[PDB]
Amino acid sequence: TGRLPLDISLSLTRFLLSEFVPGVGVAFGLFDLIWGFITPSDWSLFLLQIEQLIEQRIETLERNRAITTLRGLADSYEIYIEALREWEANPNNAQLREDVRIRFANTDDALITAINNFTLTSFEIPLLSVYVQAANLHLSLLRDAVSFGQGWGLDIATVNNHYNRLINLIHRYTKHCLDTYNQGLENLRGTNTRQWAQFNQFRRDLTLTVLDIVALFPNYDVRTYPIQTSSQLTREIYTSSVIEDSPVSANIPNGFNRAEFGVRPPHLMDFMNSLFVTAETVRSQTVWGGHLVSSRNTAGNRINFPSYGVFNPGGAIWIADEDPRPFYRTLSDPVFVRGGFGNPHYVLGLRGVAFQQTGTNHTRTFRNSGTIDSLDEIPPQDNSGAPWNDYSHVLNHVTFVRWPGEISGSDSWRAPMFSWTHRSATPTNTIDPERITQIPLVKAHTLQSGTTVVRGPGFTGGDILRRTSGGPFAYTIVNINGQLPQRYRARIRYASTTNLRIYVTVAGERIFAGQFNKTMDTGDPLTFQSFSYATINTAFTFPMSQSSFTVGADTFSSGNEVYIDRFELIPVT
Numbered sequence: 001t002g003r004l005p006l007d008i009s010l011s012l013t014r015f016l017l018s019e020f021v022p023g024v025g026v027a028f029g030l031f032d033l034i035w036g037f038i039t040p041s042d043w044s045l046f047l048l049q050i051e052q053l054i055e056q057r058i059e060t061l062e063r064n065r066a067i068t069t070l071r072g073l074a075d076s077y078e079i080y081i082e083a084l085r086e087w088e089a090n091p092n093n094a095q096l097r098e099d100v101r102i103r104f105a106n107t108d109d110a111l112i113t114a115i116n117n118f119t120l121t122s123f124e125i126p127l128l129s130v131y132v133q134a135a136n137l138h139l140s141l142l143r144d145a146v147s148f149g150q151g152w153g154l155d156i157a158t159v160n161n162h163y164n165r166l167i168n169l170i171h172r173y174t175k176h177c178l179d180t181y182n183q184g185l186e187n188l189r190g191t192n193t194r195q196w197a198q199f200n201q202f203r204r205d206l207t208l209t210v211l212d213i214v215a216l217f218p219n220y221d222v223r224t225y226p227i228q229t230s231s232q233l234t235r236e237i238y239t240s241s242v243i244e245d246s247p248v249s250a251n252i253p254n255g256f257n258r259a260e261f262g263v264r265p266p267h268l269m270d271f272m273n274s275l276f277v278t279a280e281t282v283r284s285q286t287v288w289g290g291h292l293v294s295s296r297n298t299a300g301n302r303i304n305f306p307s308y309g310v311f312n313p314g315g316a317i318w319i320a321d322e323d324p325r326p327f328y329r330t331l332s333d334p335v336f337v338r339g340g341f342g343n344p345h346y347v348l349g350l351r352g353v354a355f356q357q358t359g360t361n362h363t364r365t366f367r368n369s370g371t372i373d374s375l376d377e378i379p380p381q382d383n384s385g386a387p388w389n390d391y392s393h394v395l396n397h398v399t400f401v402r403w404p405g406e407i408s409g410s411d412s413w414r415a416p417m418f419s420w421t422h423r424s425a426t427p428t429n430t431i432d433p434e435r436i437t438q439i440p441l442v443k444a445h446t447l448q449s450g451t452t453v454v455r456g457p458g459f460t461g462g463d464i465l466r467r468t469s470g471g472p473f474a475y476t477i478v479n480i481n482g483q484l485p486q487r488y489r490a491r492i493r494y495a496s497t498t499n500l501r502i503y504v505t506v507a508g509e510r511i512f513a514g515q516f517n518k519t520m521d522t523g524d525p526l527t528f529q530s531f532s533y534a535t536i537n538t539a540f541t542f543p544m545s546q547s548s549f550t551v552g553a554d555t556f557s558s559g560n561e562v563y564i565d566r567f568e569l570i571p572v573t
Contacts, residue, residue, distance in 0.1 A: 005046045005129055007379050008038065009209040010392045012136075013233070014381040016216045017424050021228045022147065024088055026140055027081060034133060035077045043070045043130065049209070050126040053202045054184065058123045069114045070130060076107045077137065084144070087152065097153045104145060104152070111138040119176060125184040128177065129209040135173035136213055139220040142166040146222050163223065170217045171528040177214045178458045178527075181206055189256070192249035193413075196259040201244065204237045204377065211235075212422070215461030217528075224533060227571075229436040233422040234269055234443065234462030236396060238262070241332035241372045242350050242415035248336065250348055251411040252403035262401040262417040266453035266463040268474070269443050270295040270303050271326065271427040272397050275319040277366050278311045282404075282412045285335055287349030288366060289414060292316070293398055298429055299445035299477045308400035309414070319355060319364045327355040328391035330418055333370025345405065349414035355395070361388035378420055396421040425462075429478045431542075433486040433571045440566045441465045441551060444474035448552075457526035460565045467562050472505075472552035476567075480542045487539040491568040492551060495530040497522045498560040502534045504567070505550035512538040513554075522561060531565060539572045 015029050044067060051057050058066065083100040090096055111134055118124070118131040142162050145152075149159035184206070188199040212233055219229055243250075243259050252258060272295045280289025290309025297303055320327075333352035338344060354369035356362070363369070380390035397419040405411045431437045442453060442463050451473050456463045465473050480486075490504040490512065496519050503513035516534040524530065553562050 002045055002048060003376060003379060004042055005049050006205065006208050007383075008034065008042075009129070009213065010379060010381040013208075013212045013216070013422075014392070016213070016219065017231055017233075020216075020219050020225070020230075022222070022226065024084060024144075027084060027144055030137055030140055031077060031081045035074045035137065036081075038074070040067050040071050043067055046129045046133075046209070047126055049205060050129060053198065053205060054125055054187065056126065058126050062121065062123065066118070066127060066130060069117060070134075073107075073110055073114055073134060073137070076103075076110045079103050080107045080141070084148075091151050097151075101152050101154065104141065107141055108138070108145075111141065115173075124180045125187075128180050128184070128206065131180075132173075132177055132210045132213050135169075135177070136217070139166065139170060139173070139217055142169065143220045143222050167221060170220060174214055174217060174459045174528040177210055181210060181458065191254070191256050193243050193246065193252070193255040193259055194249040196256045197244040197246070199256070200238060200240075200259075204239075207235065207237050208378070211458055212461065214459050217459075225436055227436060228434065229438060230432070231438045231461065232424045232426070232440055232443070234425040234440045235456065236264065236419045236421055237378065237393070238417050238419055239330065239374055239377050240415055240417040241330075241334045241353075241370075242348055242413075243417070245332075245334050245372055246336050246348055248346060248348075250403065250413045251346065252405055252413050255403075255413075258401050258403060259415070259417075262399040262415070264397060264399060264419060266455050267442075268297065268445060268447065268453060269421070269425060270297050270397070271421075272320075272395065273323050273326070274321050275398060276311075276313075276316040276321075277319060278309070278316055279367065280310060280414065282349070282414070283345075283347050283406055285337060285347045285349060285351065286367070287335065287347070287351055287414045288353070288400075288416050290400060291398060291416070295397070296427065297445040298427065298443050300428070301445065308398070309402055317366055319366065323357075325358045325360065326394035326396075327364075328358045328388060328394055329356040330354070330372075330374040330395070331356070331369040332372035332374070333368055334372065345409070345411055347412040347414075349412070350416050353416075356388065358388060358391060358394060361386075374418070374420075381423075391423065393420040393422055395419070429476060431478050431480045431488070431569045433480075433482040435571075437569045438566050439476065439478070439568070441474055441476070441564050444476045446475045448472040448474060454563075456565075459528060464563050464565050467553065468560065469558040470554040470556060472550050473564055474551065476549045476551075478542075478547055478549050480545050480547065484542055484545065487541055487572045488569045489539050489572055490536045491570055492534040492536070493531055493565040493568070494534055494553070495519050495526060495532070495563040495565075496553070496556075496560070498556040498562070500553050500560075500562060501555040502536065502551075502553045504536060505548070505552070506540050507543050507547040507549075509543070510540065512536050512540060515555075526563070530563075535570075
């Protein structure tokens with residue numbers, strides 16, 4: 001099915017979040033999930049998805065070559081995997097060492113060629129999801145050369161050069177993907193709701209098939225991540241059947257802008273657990289007219305949002321009240337109905353929607369279910385026969401945009417918009433003594449005054465925090481697994497226009513700090529290279545299994561800019 005690239009990409013994301021371990025495991029994983037699994041016809045569906053979004057097919061001859069190249073890569077990687085497996089079982093065998101060195105080089109060269117072919121082309125945009133797959137495999141292959149090169153018989157300078165290449169290529173490949181994605185998205189920027197639909201489908205599909213993978217490229221830095229690491233994707237993606245399934249552009253002013261207004265501004269993460277909906281009758285059609293969401297932050301404190309649309313507590317429909325299990329699916333029944341000679345105006349709304357719940361698969365219904373299935377847009381990350389366990393995303397929030405055109409001779413537009421977060425972004429923050437644990441700072445529960453959440457540059461997997469003067473950034477509650485006596489060090493992924501002090505406060509008591517360097521200049525676009533890792537030298541323990549953890553930065557002139565993506569806890573053993 002044409003959904004295959006989304007299915008495959010989310011299964012890969014699942015793997016790269018949950019199985020990034022030292023040894024041959026990642027190499028074997030990529031073979032089992034992608035390169036040994038996808039057929040040529042399957043690779044064609046990767047191209048097809050983006051060709052359809054941008055309404056531009058890749059020119060036939062070049063398209064056929066792309067598929068040939070991908071088939072070539074799978075053949076080359078298969079041979080490498082076999083040599084790698086044989087070598088690992090008997091590493092002192094000189095023949096097996098020579099075989100894996102040669103197969104490594106052959107696959108390296110093939111990927112270099114493939115990536116070049118997908119860059120020097122007028123079809124960079126429709127080739128972008130096969131680019132990200134070739135790039136991903138290349139980073140994995142170089143990680144293997146760094147991890148195993150000495151064992152294979154590569155000399156010190158060779159292994160070091162492959163490491164330097166690996167770090168450079170994380171940058172180059174990130175930069176290609178974001179430049180290409182940014183262009184593609186601007187190309188679809190428009191005026192109308194129909195244009196917004198296509199724009200948002202592109203955003204969503206390329207988040208799932210490209211940006212999610214790019215956000216995990218840093219994990220391939222095996223010198224920075226020499227034990228198992230766990231990432232979280234905290235970005236939201238949006239669905240809206242009212243906007244995306246309408247046969248017509250809504251007759252409303254600035255419809256694109258009004259639809260994009262329903263995307264929440266950057267914020268610390270929160271998780272809906274209550275939803276109440278008011279039905280409105282407009283020009284004879286009953287639709288979703290407004291609603292009330294309530295949520296919990298990562299500390300478990302309640303956040304009560306002002307109601308959306310026109311919400312009346314009386315006769316509200318209960319979808320959820322303080323329910324700890326989120327929804328993984330919507331089944332939407334939109335209505336697009338106009339009169340005829342006299343009354344050419346549309347009502348565009350949601351007549352009914354059913355929600356189905358993670359774990360239980362219980363259904364909660366607004367009026368009735370329909371046949372527009374969110375799983376077609378945001379599919380499971382696995383297939384066990386149970387989407388309610390296999391889901392990739394949970395329903396994080398519901399927004400609502402409206403235009404009461406019935407007042408003034410235009411369309412009656414009532415559009416609920418559904419915000420989905422990747423299940424990796426859990427409603428609480430957990431530190432594990434056997435992992436480098438990555439906690440995006442948007443998983444904080446309170447900002448210091450003067451700290452703002454800003455939209456992420458696109459390659460971090462979500463939003464980031466910014467200050468322009470010295471102070472604490474934000475306050476986080478963490479839950480520590482295992483034995484409190486485990487020592488950790490804190491490592492901060494940051495960008496800064498200035499040298500500065502970065503510190504963490506553990507449980508409100510002790511503050512550990514280091515002096516770190518400027519990484520960029522004021523105004524520079526953020527790239528992979530803008531970010532560095534600040535390792536605070538002092539190892540510490542948590543005094544309680546639930547502890548506060550503050551990240552701050554100090555000792556610089558106001559009007560600089562300091563950005564923090566995430567903190568990491570490294571177990572010291």
